[PDB]
Structure 1
Amino acid sequence: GTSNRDWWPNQLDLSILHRHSSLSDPMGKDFNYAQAFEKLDLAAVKRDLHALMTTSQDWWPADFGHYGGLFIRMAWHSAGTYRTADGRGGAGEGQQRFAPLNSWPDNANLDKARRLLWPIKQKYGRAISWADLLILTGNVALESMGFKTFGFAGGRADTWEPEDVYWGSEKIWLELSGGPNSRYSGDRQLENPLAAVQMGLIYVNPEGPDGNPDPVAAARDIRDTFARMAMNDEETVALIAGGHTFGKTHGAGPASNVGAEPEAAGIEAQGLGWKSAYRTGKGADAITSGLEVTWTTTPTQWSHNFFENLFGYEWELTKSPAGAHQWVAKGADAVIPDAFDPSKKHRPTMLTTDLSLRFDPAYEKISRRFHENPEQFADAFARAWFKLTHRDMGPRARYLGPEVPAEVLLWQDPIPAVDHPLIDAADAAELKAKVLASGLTVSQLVSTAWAAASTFRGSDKRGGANGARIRLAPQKDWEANQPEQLAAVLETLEAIRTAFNGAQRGGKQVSLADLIVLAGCAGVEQAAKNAGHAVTVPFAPGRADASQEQTDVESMAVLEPVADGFRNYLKGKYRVPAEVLLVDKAQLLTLSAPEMTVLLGGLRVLGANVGQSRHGVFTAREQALTNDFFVNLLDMGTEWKPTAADADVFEGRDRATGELKWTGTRVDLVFGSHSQLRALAEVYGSADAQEKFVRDFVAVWNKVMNLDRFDLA
């Protein structure tokens, strides 16, 4: 059947905003995963997982009698899709069980690993999510093999449909770089937001860049992709060498023996794929990657044998039975065990990407330190494994269960505990009046609270107004945040705060994070008053102020809004149309299409635009909360045309006289063009909609202010 996407392939897709409806979710509307998990007997689950590790199933026999390496790979891949650029991917929604990830070539045979876990998932039911189980199983694998993990948190709720992620524009799995949809340009610059070198890979190609087996060049791709997953050189080396202490790769015959990935397989395969015609198709005859390497002399036990071998041998370029490039130790004895035949031994082998850890000069220094000091290696790997598997969980308030690490880590963007009484409703009313009496305007108050709260993204639950990091580097200097204007507002609010806090007894105080939010609430109430409407905007106290020393400035860079349609802002000139960037932002804010439409039309008339731009300010009563954006945009008495200076800026002129009435950008005018967004704009632009517009604006403003409030969940 031909679809709208077929006819109009470039038209904007609003379906990304309407996933996760209560329709698609089999659990009741009142289901609370955290409540279920908190009563899980986690120790019993781990005892079951420990038993599974050495209980081989004949349909996918265990290498060395132990599934631990397979499960570590499973958990690593679940987490390894994460990109810092947008926060998308990662292990936090259990997306490896859905398309496309369930069928990426790098996930081959993890379908078998997940099937091995069905009996335990079935036993525990709703009290452990697939998402949590996949990570837990990797931790139990590590523990079972002698490695002390840093800890584990539950709380990843399951999802029920595929996430909408841009994974690249190639139409061929694993396509080498430089094709018509190349993800590389310039001097090997990978396009943002991508974090893998080839479509369907987790990070890098194990044979080397585009298949060229050069460890020094491979190291470049490792460093770039791991940095795009938030890992530095020490963490990178720890992870790779730590992982490759365990298990083996699978390449026993040619890859042409392997059939369809799971999403392409026949119905009889019952959700599995990569069925192999090579010999028994499994076990000793398995084919996964096509490589055939076993890294250590004890693949089922933690050791420091990976670095002993990497540094203790010289390496020769060789081919696996499937034809893939890999390396074997020159002159070595057969010291590596075979996975099924106790009478066979093999020489040490390595991937090109393993040899990167020795031939790249900066990695070599770390690797040598880890070789000489294996305790340092173990601690770095434990810490990096925790970070990897938790990076997208969000604030520490979301962490559940008895094994949560007590150490607070800088990468968690930590928020101090609150140790004093909070303001009550009468205090909040007193503070809103003080804020309005200061002379701060509706535009100032709205713009500041919007800047603080709108850094949130639901993909990895980073950002938001909690912390008051807007006052700190780097947020206080972002161009979108209007740094001189911001400084002036924050000075005024900090004086209000000092005066209120100095007058209290009993230790009650207000944080600056809460006062920034409350001040924005006062601005919205005042704008409603300016329109003739008395409303109260909800406010929940309890945010705390983080320090500069508790803030990693480099990690915060990815949260800079370079396109924020809600403030009519674009930092530079981009390939992707601005309207598509607005819908991307709305999805990170967790907004529906109706919510995005109300919010933007309100912000326009409140004065939230960066630079006091008049684009989209379709009112003669700025700083009053009215529906004038929608009534004016939809007025057929105005004709619109792109300007000669800039095709992305439009003039609205009276159709009869030619008089200039307005200007707007693509972000403004999409609401009068897109057939679905225009239908929404019509509801809010109708003669009966003033009350509705106000109510719905207040509700979506309060939603945005609370996005990071997992302390109240």
Structure 2
Amino acid sequence: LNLKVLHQNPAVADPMGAAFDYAAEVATIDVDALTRDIEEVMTTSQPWWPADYGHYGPLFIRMAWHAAGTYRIHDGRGGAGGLDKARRLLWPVKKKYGKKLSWADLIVFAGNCALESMGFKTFGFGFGRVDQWEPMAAAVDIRETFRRMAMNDVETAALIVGGHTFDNSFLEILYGYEWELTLATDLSLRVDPIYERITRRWLEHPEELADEFAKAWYKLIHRDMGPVARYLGPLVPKQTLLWQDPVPAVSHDLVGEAEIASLKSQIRASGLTVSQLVSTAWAAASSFRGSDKRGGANGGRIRLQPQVGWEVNDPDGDLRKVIRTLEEIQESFNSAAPGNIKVSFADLVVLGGCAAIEKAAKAAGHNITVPFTPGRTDASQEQTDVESFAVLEPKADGFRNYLGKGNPLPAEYMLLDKANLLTLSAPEMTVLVGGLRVLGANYKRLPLGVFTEASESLTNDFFVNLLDMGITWEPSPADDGTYQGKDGSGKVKWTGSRVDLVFGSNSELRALVEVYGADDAQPKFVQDFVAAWDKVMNLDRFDV
């Protein structure tokens, strides 16, 4: 277990300070002048890297395709936001800006501006990628290496008849001046029956090739930038594309105080317990990825087919029994509302969680208020893509004590990895795990890691009964990968799992439960849990 994976890119290694927000800088650069500079960095030879073709044009394209073409789909890492000695031709145009133009944006925009310089009208560009501080056989091969990037066979036979022309130029030679049967790993586009059926219509109708490479290039660029609220700069198009998982714009007045209070009192006052709401408000926000920032709470998609039908969000009678009630509350507050105000369901799926915690914490030792920032919208069914969310499904979720079949790594490295995707830190991991276990959020309400005694109460009893050494941890009586805490008198008292006992058997993490497991550190744990919960609920709020 290497906890260094959690605190990657600290503010200590950031030379720009903690007061430097990228979104407030990149909106001040005139892209009508930057594009008149990258148009001069090329067509200007250098001694150390000669070109002598009149352009560093077909080299900037191969520096965006070879940099934003390493986007793995199964875990989302790599890609844009994440040649090496050749990105110094661009120094004579980054030094004029410095902090206002990160290296990733500069590389990719140089690629796009080259593509626009060679006589092509690209679909559009959006800035915002903040930079961190750290032979049919060949046909099936290129098909598979373009499937780890999630591009269908019409957007991978248009990239290859694309960035190899630098549009009826690559074609009209490929089975044009037909070969003598003796090129490269290409030429697959004429022999493979899958590609040959599409990359032959374009030979006589190029009009549907230009505006297919155009929108297959504005997918290799803005693939891992997230929802369309980070596309800064004035170049972004005014059009919605399906692969961004769009959400409708706010067309209704939001809710202020004296209305949030009414909603989070009504949620308490109708049926739903404390271990139901915190299981729905977490399921709808445990499908986020810090890299390739897609998913998250927003959209209100936990009511929709690709995500209400997963296994972790157990639909056996739990999830569909709470979506019906929240939907019922939504219609009652949407009629005779206190004004011209309506509430999107993507709030009650989270505003339920805050009222659930405020019902538990107020019942354990003391009352609090959980921050909740409205401004979420519900996306209809036609706007989702049930094929691209099969990769968001967590094969193993460590917070809800889920362990599905087909696990590469052991049961705790997956918890560590997931807590990295949510961009969490070790104290936040520990406090959030404790809160989820004590509150009650385990998959199918297993009494595993339920070290408290009274359910539905936000105590720190998970961190107190784990450390008490009077109990003994013997896997032997059990059968599967679960433990069992025999009391000092021999009677079984608790139960555990590989995800819970790791907090009391790893000296790097056992030092992070003694902070919350003390005697006078009850209020600190509650405040830290509410802070972590608020941070997790607000992982997909880029408008604010």
Alignment TM-score, normalising by the size of structure 1: 0.75
Higher relative contact order (CA 8 A, sep 6+): 2
1:504-523 → structure 2 map (5 Å cutoff): 504=337, 506-523=339-356
1:449 aligns with 2:281: yes
Distance across 1 between alignment mates of 2:202 and 2:178 = 19
Task: Give matches, 1:190-205, under 5 Å.
Answer: none
Aligned partner letter, 2:114: A
Q: CA deviation at 1:645?
A: 5.3
Q: Which residue of 1 aligns with 2:49?
A: 60
* 1:418 Cα deviation after fit: 0.6
What is the CA deviation profile of residues 469-526 of structure 1, one whole-angstrom value per residue up to 9, with x for unaligned ones? Answer: 0000110111100113111101001111100110215420111001111011000011
Looking at structure 1, the residues matched to 217 and 339 of structure 2 have their Cα atoms a distance apart, in angstroms, of: 44
Partner of 1:114: 87
Please point out which of 660, 672, 680 is paired with 2:492.
660
What does residue 688 of structure 1 align with?
520
In angstroms, what is the RMSD of aligned CA positions? Answer: 1.3
State the match for 1:173 in structure 2.
none
Residue 309 of structure 1: which of 168, 173, 178 is its match?
Answer: 173
Correspondence 1:36 to 2:9? no
SS of corresponding position for 2:173: helix
Paired residue for 2:459, among 614, 617, 626?
A: 626
Equivalent position of 1:153 in the other structure: 126
Question: Is the 2:157–2:195 Cα contact (8 Å) retained in structure 1?
Answer: yes
Instruction: Give the alignment of 1:322-401 within 5 angstroms.
Output: 350-352=183-185, 354-401=186-233
Q: Match for residue 635 of structure 1? A: 468
Letter in 1 for 2:460: N
Q: Any conservation in 1 of the 2:252–2:341 contact (CA below 8 Å)?
A: yes
Task: Tell me how far apart the structure 2 counterparts of residues 585 and 646 of structure 1 sit (CA, whole Å).
Answer: 27
Partner of 2:260: 428
Q: Contact (CA 8 Å) 2:478, 2:484: kept in 1 or not?
A: no
Instruction: Indicate the residue corresponding to 1:697 in structure 2.
Output: 529
Answer 1 or 2: which has greater helix percent.
1
Residue pair 1:639, 1:653 contacting (<8 A) in 2 also: yes
Q: Distance in 2 between matches of 1:455 and 1:643?
A: 35
**What aligned pairs does 1:479-498 form with structure 2 within 5 A after superposition?**
479-483=311-315, 484-498=317-331
Aligned-partner Cα distance in 2 for 1:149–1:464: 30
Provide the rounded CA distance (Å) in 2 between the counterparts of 1:525 and 1:538: 10
Q: Give the Cα–Cα distance (whole angstroms) in 1 for the partners of residues 503 and 94 of structure 2.
A: 45
| Partner of residue 501 from structure 1, selected from 331, 334, 351 | 334
Aligned position for 2:148:
228
Q: Which residue number corresponds to residue 241 of structure 1?
A: 161
Letter in 2 for 1:310: L
The superposition leaves residues 515-569 of structure 1 with CA deviations (integer Å, 9 ceiling, x where unpaired) of 1110110000111022021011110101000011010110111111121110000
Aligned pairs for 1:532-681 within 5 A = 532-643=365-476, 646-654=479-487, 656-681=488-513
Q: In the alignment, what sits opposite 1:104?
A: none
Q: 1:178-198: CA deviations, max 9, x gaps?
A: xxxxxxxxxxxxxxxxxxxxx
Structure 2 contact 41–93 (Cα < 8 Å) conserved: no
What displacement does 1:696 show?
0.2
Share of identical aligned residues, percent? Answer: 67
Structure 1 counterpart SS, 2:284: helix
Alignment check: 8 A CA contact 1:449 1:517 kept:
yes
User: 1:74 pairs with 48, 52, 63, which one?
Assistant: 63
Residue 300 of structure 2 corresponds to 468
Query: Where do residues 93-108 of structure 1 align in structure 2 (5 Å cutoff)?
Result: 93=82
Q: Please say if residues 68 and 80 of structure 2, whose CA atoms lie closer than 8 Å, have aligned partners that are also in contact.
A: yes
Using the alignment, how far apart are the partners of 1:392 and 1:120 within structure 2?
A: 25
> CA 1:381–1:604 in 2, change beyond 3 Å: closer, same or farther?
same
**Are the counterparts in 2 of residues 563 and 571 from structure 1 also a CA contact under 8 Å?**
yes
1:135: which partner in 2?
108
Amino acid at match of 1:235: E
| Per-residue deviation, residues 34-82 of structure 1 (Å, max 9, x unmatched) | 1111001111111110112211112111152211111001011111110
CA-to-aligned-CA distance 1:337-364 (integer Å, 9 cap, x gap) = xxxxxxxxxxxxx312x11222211111
Matched letter for residue 384 of structure 1? A
Q: Distance in 1 between matches of 2:86 and 2:35?
A: 16
Tell whether the 8 Å contact from 2:395 to 2:407 is kept in structure 1 after alignment: no
Q: List gaps (5 residues or longer) in structure 2.
A: none
Q: How far apart are residue 647 of structure 1 and its match?
A: 4.8
- Shift of the 614–628 alpha-carbon distance from structure 1 to 2, 3 Å rule, reads same
Q: Which has the larger radius of gyration?
A: 1
Q: What code does the residue aligned with 2:57 have?
A: G
Structure 1 consecutive aligned stretches of length 4 or more whose deviation exceeds 3 Å = 313-316, 643-647
**Superposed displacement of residue 404, structure 1:** 0.2
Q: Distance in 2 between matches of 1:643 and 1:50?
A: 70
Could you list the per-position Cα deviations for residues 369-421 of structure 1 after superposition, in whole angstroms to 9, with x for gaps in the alignment?
A: 22222121111111011111001001101110111011100100101001121
Greater strand share, 1 or 2? 1
TM (norm. structure 2) is: 0.98
In the other structure, the counterpart of 1:459 is 291
Q: Supply the distance in 1 between the matched residues of 2:451 and 2:138 (Cα, whole angstroms).
A: 54
SS in 2 for 1:558: coil
CA separation in 2, counterparts of 1:474 and 1:231? 19
Partner deviation per Cα, 1:131-161 (whole Å, 9 max, x = no partner): 1111100111111100110000001112111
Whether the aligned pair in 1 keeps the contact of 2:224 and 2:292 (CA below 8 Å) is yes
Q: Distance between the aligned counterparts of 2:477 and 2:224, measured in 1?
A: 45
Matched to 1:30, the amino acid is A
Read off the aligned partner of 2:400 and give its amino acid letter.
R
State whether residues 88 and 459 of structure 1, in contact with CA within 8 Å, keep that contact through their aligned partners in structure 2: yes
